[PDB]
TrEMBL record, chains A, B:
Its cofactor is pyridoxal 5'-phosphate. Belongs to the class-III pyridoxal-phosphate-dependent aminotransferase family. The gene is gacK. Pyridoxal 5'-phosphate binds at G99, T100, T251. This is C-6' aminotransferase. The modification N6-(pyridoxal phosphate)lysine (covalent) is found at K224.
Length: 408, 408
């Protein structure tokens, strides 16, 4: 009631935050003792599992100053910077506490280095007001043009390339395919405009590297997969585009628990093994759930893969009913957005989650059988999870109509 | 070569970061095993002491999932928000990961609510480019006017109050006193312009509250004293001025180790006990050092008090020799800036530090006996620590001369 902010978190049907007392692996316990399976995982930043013991031991030693203190440089920092450069590439690297701060700092630096006013953007880049706009496809008061992953609009803006400082995108892989990325990179290379890959969510999510070799980013940002939820974001790329980062310093720069969590987590994510385990387990859950709904006439499908997926519901009434039924079974989904299992989502948890889905499907069967997913269902669902337009065939006038329906 | 940023940290005479491989309480250990006494304390954010055991145990349990998960609201968050409001006042409260992020967010929010373009500013508010300017006393490209704590310039701008959204200051108490704050508040009340008290450094520093009852802030920010170095900043104040905070959310909002550090630290800082202990211990060190230098003819005085103080050297050559002698004895000062002891600066550590100061004084004796502390010495020393002009009597023409000397 005192809070001036509106943090994203699980909320009940009345909008009140759901409180959880404790967590271990994939399971959360609520104040009433009920155990829930977490698919939200701090918005995808818990990738190893809640309370992971190896990370916890490193955090605990760091909380006692055993490898360094917040006052000063220590060998842990050298190790972390080297790990980031090895896995993501680039001339130089930088560190931040949030993805929002990293994206603002990098975008300002690139704009300054390029001495150009316009930035073309798709995807969410954090809460800073520099990204706010009243309308898509036109510059906001900060010179940023939201293009909603529409390549026709992008090509239009890139046809006059001399004023375009950069193109910044948060890559989606549920609704954008290989053809989208090949054309995106062709267009940006043709205009000679640097690409900023905002991989806060997808960097290290699917493999031990950035999300797609079909992008050639001049600058990257990663964060959620770096530190099992501890507040660390990293950036890197071409030195001349990041020169202004020399002006960046913050009080908690050397704080040791954050670096302990990042070095320990990154070492495991750099092997690719957690992402392979998550992919297999999540794929099993997706296949079971898709069939459970399809075999009961429930108009809900899924997009994505085991590492990152989402539910696609026929309409908002179906989605609301699904979310209520899922919560009643103790499934904790990121409602209307993407689901991101952690490595603690093992076969035993998959089996538990599938039984809960069987009960969700039972609760919904017979309520919505005469409804079907339409193109509108797909666009609306994708919009909520990846913050722009799915890559489905349409004309320039149809783009305007879809945006008119979905833009708030 | 790898790091694109230039973080503030202790550096040797060649500008290279000093490496410390562990720390505990008031002592840091360098790669050669030598123990130094820390007066920097992560730029004043370690106020209980490195590796404080109560905080460490809480962080460790939080790292094991015992006190909530990053996915959701936890049982302890309400107690954090409630105590922040009890200690600092205000209608509503918000949380951030750095002081830089807090200051940018609240300044943008206040300006938006006031629907006015100009912000008058003194003091450091973080690294964001919105604060960068080429010259003082005139608006930068973001509408920010740096006034260097000069009340004649402030009064001139406040004489056209209709365009002034807010006045944001980082309060200093080494070089600004009752006279300055009484007049600052008189001017801002007369203009009916809200004050943003950037208490990132001084909030909770001197007592269980904000830094001076002579300020009446509409918005406050605290951070360094809140979480023993973990990355937590807090804001609060008038609900309508912070309306835009409803759009603030970030992935790590509920991260449990930060929450454990802030709640455990705030519960202790809210009693006033650490601040009283630091004040007494630091006052003993100041008194000993002032007398040692005065008896040896060493032209170095001190300003401030046990919670936050600085050295005032006659000139840069004296300062350079002082800092080299101090490093040789294992005193780790924040060079040219403020010293901020932690609660680990106990009587035993005071005695050790006084012995090291005895050796510093002996090493400086006879080298600078013919040097006086001028007005130039005081203004230059204060400028480095509190980022503007000390409140010492001066003419308007003298203000121009000082600013011309010290602005870069
Ligand atoms: C007009 N714009 C509309 C807005 O309402 C706004 O909606 C956002 C919504 O996008 C957001 O969800 C997205 O982001 C979360 C969290 N991701 C963070 C992130 C950052 C910032 O990092 P930080 O949190 O500061 O550490 C930077 N870059 C990327 C790629 C990030 O993912 C993701 O978890 C969700 O998957 C993603 N949809 C909501 N959390 C808050 C809403 N206000 O923008 C989109 C919308 C509809 O268009
Ligand atoms: C050449 N011009 C100069 C600028 O470069 C710039 O100088 C700063 C200097 O002020 C800074 O020291 C000050 O700040 C440190 C750290 N305190 C942070 C702080 C914040 C931001 O919090 P965050 O770090 O993001 O968590 C917000 N508000 C306050 C009140 C803060 O203290 C303090 O520890 C020092 O005591 C203080 N002097 C240097 N660390 C870096 C320099 N670049 O601004 C001043 C000057 C003239 O303009």
């Amino acid at each position: 009631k005192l809070l001036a902010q509106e943090p994203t978190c699980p909320r009940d049907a009345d909008g009140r935050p759901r409180v959880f007392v404790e967590g271990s692996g994939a399971y959360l316990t609520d104040p009433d003792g009920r155990r829930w399976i977490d698919f939200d995982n701090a918005r995808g930043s818990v990738v190893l599992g809640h309370g992971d013991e190896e990370v916890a031991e490193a955090i605990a030693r760091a909380a006692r100053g055993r490898s360094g203190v917040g006052t000063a440089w220590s060998p842990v920092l050298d190790s972390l910077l080297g790990q980031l450069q090895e896995v993501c590439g680039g001339d130089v690297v930088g560190l931040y506490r949030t993805g929002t701060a990293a994206l603002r700092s990098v975008t300002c630096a690139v704009r300054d280095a390029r001495d150009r006013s316009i930035v073309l953007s798709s995807g969410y880049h954090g809460y800073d007001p520099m990204w706010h706009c009243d309308e898509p496809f036109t510059p906001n008061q900060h010179g940023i043009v939201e293009f909603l992953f529409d390549l026709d609009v992008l090509a239009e803006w890139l046809s006059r390339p001399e004023q375009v400082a950069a193109v910044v995108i948060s890559p989606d892989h549920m609704h954008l395919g290989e053809r989208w990325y090949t054309e995106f990179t062709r267009l940006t290379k043709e205009a000679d405009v640097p690409v900023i890959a905002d991989e806060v969510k997808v960097g290290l999510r699917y493999r031990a590297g950035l999300s797609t070799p079909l992008l050639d980013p001049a600058v990257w940002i990663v964060a959620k997969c770096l530190a099992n939820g501890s507040p660390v974001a990293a950036v890197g790329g071409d030195a001349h585009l990041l020169a202004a980062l020399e002006d960046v310093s913050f009080t908690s720069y050397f704080e040791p628990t954050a670096m302990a969590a990042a070095t320990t987590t990154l070492r495991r994510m750099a092997t690719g093994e957690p992402q392979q385990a998550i992919r297999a387990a999540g794929d099993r859950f997706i296949a079971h759930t898709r069939a459970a709904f399809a075999n009961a006439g429930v108009p809900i499908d899924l997009a994505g893969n085991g590492n990152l997926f989402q539910f696609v519901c026929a309409d908002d009434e179906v989605a609301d009913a699904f979310h209520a039924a899922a919560a009643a079974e103790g499934l904790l989904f990121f409602e209307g957005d993407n689901q991101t299992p952690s490595a603690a989502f093992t076969d035993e948890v998959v089996e538990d989650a599938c039984g809960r889905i069987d009960r969700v499907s039972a609760a919904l069967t017979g309520r919505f059988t005469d409804r079907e997913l339409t193109e509108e269902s797909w666009y609306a669902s994708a919009w909520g999870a990846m913050d722009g337009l799915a890559d489905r065939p349409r004309t320039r006038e149809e783009t305007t109509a879809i945006v008119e329906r979905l833009w708030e």
